[PDB]
Design a protein around this ligand. Structure first.
Ligand SMILES: Cc1ncc(C[n+]2csc(CCOP(=O)(O)OP(=O)(O)O)c2C)c(N)n1
Ligand SMILES: Cc1ncc(C[n+]2csc(CCOP(=O)(O)OP(=O)(O)O)c2C)c(N)n1
Ligand SMILES: [Mg+2]
Ligand SMILES: [Mg+2]
Lengths: 806, 412
């Protein structure tokens, strides 16, 4: 559960003290000095003479155009957290301002705790300076290695979705979400503005969006900064916000005059937020206007105004590095030396090199710190889900009526299971879906919870299962759902989210980024505890898009997921639910797991059930298993072909083809691969099937016919070094489809039962079976003409039931 | 190149001190006394008794209808330049108010430097008084012989064009351009109002037009003073200005009450100007509304109210000389003596005749002074043009095809 920390939502009821703002100004100066020492210096952190070009880095990498503004905001937020005792997580949208975050971690004392070799003295300062963006050092962005970070910020557009996710079901947590003005042009964040219509001020926390409007992107100005102030305020008010505006640094006003002004504006905003929270305890049915801060400052605000006669401060020329070579001229080194001395570090550091005590007296202590806040490290919060007994949801008719029974929909079983998980776990488990929960048949959870909706209600003929609080969030944006769930998991909670297969590509970037958060975490960051897994139910898949057609058919999610399987990280799982029982086993395993991205590919269509629960779990631990009840060959020597399958429709076609093969006396084996990554190379993947086990499943000399859900490229690229891999003949999706009957969909991809039987016959003896092969091939065309003439699939195809049903 | 002087475009961020306004009032009194001694006196500058008609000039020439208002503005501008360290050149549009300019040059110390024989004592004061508009003396207008002057002002209509010219390519220079209300009727200055559409606040300096609206020309009132205040503000706003208005001397308000009020109004205007300048460093593509000051005062503001039963102060009768003959009657000499004693010169000058030290403590020093500013003496700034080699542009076809060749255009 999310803990209550400090004294939440308290008003100051006093002026901001002068001593605190003294401390805030000194903090800002020292944070800018650290952020510059990191970029430029490799030695001599405190500029003991001789300070020469020997002390400067050979290759200057990093960013400065956002760092002083971030340091300003972070120092003021630190004063605020010390004063109010607020439970606060900062989300840094422009993550390229990494030196700001590392300077915070260093100054609040958490960096030395996490990394003991970076001491708080001259040698520790030298190591801290050298390690930024260095061989064998720390990254340039706001990284998982950086304490106090739940968001990398490298790939832009997801500060707001992550903020609204982090506050969900989390009522005491305050999140200032700093948003770059260039990042605000990206598609994800524009729609992430509208997510205050999906949170409740009573049951969820408060997100304060700080638009960091410094006017410029890389080498280009931002649209928001160059439209009129009337337009900007009108725009933010049309999205349910009260815009506040702060402008600074565009004239010669004294720094204290700026710190004081920001203190009054900040306390005004805090009082509006506290009023909203206090009102929500009585009335939470009508939405408030949350304050949001527009923070207009010059880009690179403390750097030299002009360098080489080019406007540097207040321009895009300060984005990455002013003084691109302070190492190769004497004039640029003098500019750099003057820039470092303009902060007066001589008074901010003591003799031994530690930041002076009066510079950090205004700082929060203990669990209130940014790097120490448990919501930033959501693995220490996390507790296991309390799971219902799986046998309660098993489809038992397979156990007595025989394999292949029924016309059930696989995802309804997961719906019931997830409903009871929600029942056992309220306020820790949440279901997201881009308008598609009821189309993936996960609506059984409406028996115990509602869709959280905080826009207007109009009627009850149209607004069923909607409520101002709920455990089902549903907005038509995959970016929103994925950012919500990722921030939900990163804070310590659990969740599933469902989607159409073809639109998972919309978040290929986001998944990639999350994998990079996991790949980095499992490799080099032990102090970050495991978080829950990102569970993605992929349904309404390529083979059954009757209503939509070719635009909704693209199973390429498997390929993008296969690219993140390296160095024994195991941060990826791709599971194929052949039926409801296998889906139960997969979902149980996935809900128990940690630090992974689990894509469970299950169909919503009426499909037969093949396994019992014990059989499903037994197939699960191996990933691939032989179906002894479907095989006609007792041992590996007898079979004239191995028929392997991965996916519900490929499984159905393999089984129907096996029925026809039985009538011709063909001895074959039947294999089902539930988990794709078990087929990976044994030396590469230590949790994949060993080579002996793989050869036992697939006969070394005998041909293997493989029917696969996605593109066959993904199977062939995975088994390349496996034994008997030359004989594998993968049949997968082949970018051929439309709106048409279900048999046609598999016909045009050469994955129907007739084509599979003909493929197996050709693997054995093309000459002996020539007449039967011809008969099958002309039957495919007759059965297509049947669907054209009559509008539905052939009775031979529709009515087929497996021979193993009693 | 135009130099950067002092600390340009700085806000005060404090109240104007009381001591500075004490100094400004004493400066205004002593400047009026000097401006009257120049017109009327030939001997006995400090009125040691016997002060008789022997001490008065035979031929009284000069102008007074604008001089006390100019002294007021110049003393306040001096306080401002001392406080802010501004690079400032004053353009005096009504140049017939020459005694104001010469009194400034004398009081800020530059006159003695330029002219060593005009010392700062009783004999020097006597010479300074006698030399104004005299055979073998200095002119009546604000002349090239007068330090701190780039504009003669004798022929009217070119204070504004000269101001906007002086600030061009000159980003740190502040120019208060004092414009007479009669001169504002002339054709040149009416179109010189519209020249804020040809200067850039970033690359050029700032001109502050001060309309010296005392209501009267020679023997006639001005059109601008007799139209409604709504019309005047609407007119100045249609030309890209923010009108500010100051009114003084039309009642019995205390002088300090006037100096304080002007201090507050002036600092408000300066803050708007400094905001414009700071904004121009970021955005210089959209034109601001520059402040301009409308300075409504009575013509000849410290002179006797009535002379010969005719309204003198606040009228056009004070344009050139009230008391056209203080030498030919005893009554007019008594009026003149009372006028000189109304400034209490007994406390503004010491025993030896120098202006007392506390009267000029609020004054700017060094290069910031009006008479010492290098932009007033533009010959010390000047450097030669770097000229391309002439032979590069010669028409060479004459050299080989013969004289009389071609159909070229000479000005290309
Ligand atoms: C989607 C995406 N496109 C491009 C980039 C490359 N990139 C990195 S930083 C940056 C500019 C930052 O813009 P803004 O949000 O205005 O930041 P700031 O002004 O704080 O530097 C860009 C385009 C990115 N990170 N993500
Ligand atoms: C073009 C032109 N016409 C006539 C004159 C004669 N002249 C000298 S002073 C003066 C009146 C001054 O008018 P105004 O600007 O109102 O001055 P103030 O009230 O300050 O005396 C005139 C008409 C002149 N100098 N220039
Ligand atoms: Mg920006
Ligand atoms: Mg006049």
């Amino acid at each position: 559960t999310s803990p209550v920390i400090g004294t939440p939502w308290k008003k100051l009821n006093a002026p901001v003290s002068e001593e605190a703002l003294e401390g805030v100004d000194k903090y800002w100066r020292v944070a800018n000095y650290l952020s510059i020492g990191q970029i430029y210096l490799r030695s001599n952190p405190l500029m003991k003479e001789p300070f020469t070009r020997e002390d400067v880095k050979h290759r200057l990498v990093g960013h400065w155009g956002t760092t002083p503004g971030l340091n300003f905001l972070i120092g003021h937020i630190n004063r605020f957290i010390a004063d109010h005792g607020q439970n606060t997580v900062i989300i840094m949208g422009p993550g390229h301002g990494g030196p700001a975050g590392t300077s915070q971690s260093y100054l609040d004392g958490t960096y030395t705790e996490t990394f003991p070799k970076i001491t708080k003295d001259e040698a520790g300062l030298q190591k801290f300076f050298r390690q930024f963006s260095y061989p064998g050092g720390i990254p340039s962005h706001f990284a998982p290695e950086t304490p106090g970070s739940i968001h990398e910020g490298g790939e832009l557009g997801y500060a707001l979705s992550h903020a609204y996710g982090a506050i969900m079901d989390n009522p005491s947590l305050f999140v200032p979400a700093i948003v770059g003005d260039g990042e605000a042009e990206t598609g994800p964040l524009a729609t992430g503005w509208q997510s205050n219509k999906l949170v409740n001020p009573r049951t969820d926390g408060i997100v304060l969006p700080i638009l960091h409007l410094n006017g410029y992107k890389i080498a280009n100005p931002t649209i928001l900064s160059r439209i009129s102030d009337e337009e900007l305020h009108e725009f933010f008010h049309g999205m349910g916000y009260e815009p506040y505006e702060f402008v600074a640094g565009f004239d010669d006003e004294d720094h204290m005059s700026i710190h004081r002004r920001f203190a009054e504006l900040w306390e005004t905003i805090w009082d509006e937020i506290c009023d909203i929270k206090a009102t929500a305890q009585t009335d939470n049915v009508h939405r408030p206007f949350y304050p949001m801060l527009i923070f207009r400052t010059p880009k690179g605000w403390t750097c030299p105004k002009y360098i080489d006669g080019k406007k540097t401060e207040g321009s895009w020329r300060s984005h990455q590095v002013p003084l691109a070579s302070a190492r190769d001229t004497e004039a640029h080194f003098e500019v750099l030396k003057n820039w470092l001395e303009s902060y007066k570090p001589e008074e901010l550091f003591d003799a031994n090199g530690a930041v002076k005590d009066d510079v950090l007296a205004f700082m929060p202590k203990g669990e209130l710190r940014i790097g120490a806040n448990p919501n930033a490290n959501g693995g220490v919060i996390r507790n296991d889900l309390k799971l219902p007994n799986l046998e309660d949801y098993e489809v038992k008719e397979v156990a007595e009526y025989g394999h292949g029974w029924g016309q059930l929909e696989a995802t309804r079983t997961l719906g019931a299971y997830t409903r009871d998980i929600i029942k056992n776990n309220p306020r820790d488990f949440r279901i997201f879906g881009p308008d598609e929960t009821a189309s993936n048949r996960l609506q059984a959870s409406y028996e115990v919870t509602n869709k959280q909706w905080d826009a207007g209600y109009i009627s009850d003929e149209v607004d069923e299962h909607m409520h101002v609080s709920g455990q089902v969030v549903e907005q038509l944006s995959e970016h929103q759902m994925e950012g919500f769930l990722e921030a939900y998991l990163l804070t310590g909670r659990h969740g599933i989210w469902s989607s159409y297969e073809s639109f998972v590509h919309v978040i290929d970037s986001m998944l990639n980024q999350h994998a990079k958060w996991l790949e980095a975490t499992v490799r080099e960051i032990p102090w970050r505890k495991p978080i829950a897994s990102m569970n993605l139910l992929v349904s309404s898949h390529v083979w059954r898009q009757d209503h939509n057609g070719f635009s909704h058919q693209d199973p390429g999610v498997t390929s993008v997921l296969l690219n993140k399987c390296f160095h024994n990280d195991h941060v990826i799982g791709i599971y194929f639910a052949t039926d409801a029982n296998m889906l139960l086993a997969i979902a149980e395993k996935c809900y128990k797991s940690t630090n992974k991205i689990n894509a469970i590919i299950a169909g919503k269509q009426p499909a037969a059930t093949w396994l019992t629960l014990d059989e499903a779990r037994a197939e699960l631990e191996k990933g691939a298993a032989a179906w002894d009840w479907a095989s006609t060959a007792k041992n590996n020597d007898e079979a004239e072909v191995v028929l392997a399958a991965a996916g519900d429709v490929p499984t159905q076609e393999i089984m129907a083809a096996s029925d026809k093969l039985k009538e011709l006396g063909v001895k074959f084996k039947v294999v089902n691969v539930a988990d794709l990554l078990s087929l990976q190379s044994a030396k590469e993947n230590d949790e994949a099937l060993t080579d002996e086990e793989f050869a036992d499943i697939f006969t070394a000399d005998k041909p293997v016919l493989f029917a696969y859900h996605s593109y066959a490229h993904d199977v062939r690229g995975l088994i390349y070094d496996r034994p008997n891999h030359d004989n594998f003949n993968v049949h997968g999706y082949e970018e051929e489809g439309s709106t048409t009957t279900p048999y046609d969909m598999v016909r045009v991809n050469r994955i129907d039962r007739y084509e599979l039987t003909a493929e197996a016959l050709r693997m054995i003896d093309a000459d002996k079976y020539a007449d039967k092969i011809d008969e099958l091939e002309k039957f495919r065309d007759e059965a297509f003409q049947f669907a054209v003439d009559n509008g539905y699939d052939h009775p031979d195809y529709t009515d087929w039931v497996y021979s193993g049903v009693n």
